[PDB]
Chains A and B, each alone.
Chain A
Amino acid sequence: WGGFSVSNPTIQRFFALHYLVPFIIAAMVIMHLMALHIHGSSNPLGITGNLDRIP
């Protein structure tokens, strides 16, 4: 709270954190794409897809 109830410091730090955390989400998305790219997507059959790949 930065105080004793939801007050001016609470809303100001919620705005600062709310501006901040989407860039952490963008960094986690880049890490997500890396962990995807090391094995490629799945397919709706549940078998390998190494045979017929299209770009």
Chain B
Amino acid sequence: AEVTQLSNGIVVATEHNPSAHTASVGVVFGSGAANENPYNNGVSNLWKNIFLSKENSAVAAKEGLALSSNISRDFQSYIVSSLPGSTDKSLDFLNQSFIQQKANLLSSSNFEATKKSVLKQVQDFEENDHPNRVLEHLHSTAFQNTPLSLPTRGTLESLENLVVADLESFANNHFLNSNAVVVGTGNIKHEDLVNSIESKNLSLQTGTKPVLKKKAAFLGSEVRLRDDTLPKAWISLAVEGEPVNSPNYFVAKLAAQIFGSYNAFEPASRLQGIKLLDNIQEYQLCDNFNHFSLSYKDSGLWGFSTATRNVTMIDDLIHFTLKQWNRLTISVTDTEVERAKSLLKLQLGQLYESGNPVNDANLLGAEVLIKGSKLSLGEAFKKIDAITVKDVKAWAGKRLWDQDIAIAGTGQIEGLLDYMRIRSDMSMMRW
């Protein structure tokens, strides 16, 4: 495989997979949820859903073109998938959708129907999807009074104040030339995409997205959304992780991989090679957990989210999990590092080299927006092979051993104790 890249003010980056049967072509902007003030919050979600609106999707589906979109903290994307003989049709449709006009998408009826639909979706997310809203409050309290705290989904109190003028103001300030990368993944060649872009004009705008006054800074805090009428207790807990373009990126991900993920109901998940499972399976402390190493442009998060029904033994869950985290600084073995190497090679090659072209388009767009070129997977495997136990211990002493944490929880979290015992459990007192 190979990733090429060229420039004319726009950036054209591709992945010619000749074995695939489709071809995704779309623009990936460099603005995201982290580029909004807290009063126009959710305008990226509303651009996602006016791009995926019914009239626009119908006009797309007349030619056999499926639309896709994604709103992250750092990057938006607007991807159009088609057969590999219709890349010109997809480019001309994306041109007509964004560049040539926006007033037909931003009519009164389409905007009011879409605002109604996104208000319904945000309310449905707020009162029914519990582990994701725990993770969103974890971001909202780890990075508070700072633009990386804003949720990608938007809030009900802000999103019902947006009108068309704010949509157009965000479009003029963020849908720009240098801010964007046009991405073609799947079964298209790079030269075909560049010659077809130069065949059209496709000039988005003059350029220069506004620069944020405040950089992201981690802030140890907690938020407790206690709802006694829920059957479980969802809780995330994280420290300041590593951002992208850091030398400790793959080390932070391998540290997340050491303790892995778990599902107490699957039989092959209870037999993993984690030493936390011997403590966690005896009295059935949780139903599931997953360790995440989230990496953003300015900062990052490293921690775990979990859910449990054993609501009287939440503190034992947090206790054994954090003592296992303290094992990284002091006495992590060689076999755990080798196992995490093999599993992280596995899940990283599943992530970057799955068969779905829209996910490849999102990942390639994000990576060539942030760091200018895509690191191919072989050099990634060499960087994973270069990690030793001393690198993990040095990273854990830098980032894990007695550092501030951020906690978010909802449900029956009365069994979760104060902030100070969870904070003081980050250092063992025995080392």
A residues within 8 Å of B by Cβ? 54-55
Contacts and interface: CB of A to CB of B under 8 A. Distances in A.
Contacts of B421: 55
B256 to A, nearest CB: 30
4 contacts: A54-B418, A55-B417, A55-B418, A55-B421
Interface string B404-429: 00000000000001100100000000
A55 B319 CA distance: 15
B357 to A, nearest CB: 52
B217 to A, nearest CB: 28
A38 B418 CA distance: 22
How many chain B residues sit at the interface, stated as a range, is under 10
B355 to A, nearest CB: 51
Contacts of A55: 417-418, 421
Shortest Cβ-Cβ A-B pairs, 4 listed:
A54-B418, A55-B417, A55-B418, A55-B421
Interface string B1-38: 00000000000000000000000000000000000000
A55 B421 CA distance: 9
Contacts of A54: 418
Nearest to A51: B414
A36 to B, nearest CB: 21
A11 B301 CA distance: 73
Nearest to B417: A55
A21 B312 CA distance: 41
A33 B421 CA distance: 24
Contacts of B418: 54-55
Nearest to B418: A54
Nearest to B419: A54
Nearest to A53: B414
A54 B422 CA distance: 13
A54 B421 CA distance: 11
A55 B416 CA distance: 11
Contacts of B417: 55
A54 B224 CA distance: 14
Interface string B35-69: 00000000000000000000000000000000000
Interface in B176-219: none
A54 B418 CA distance: 6
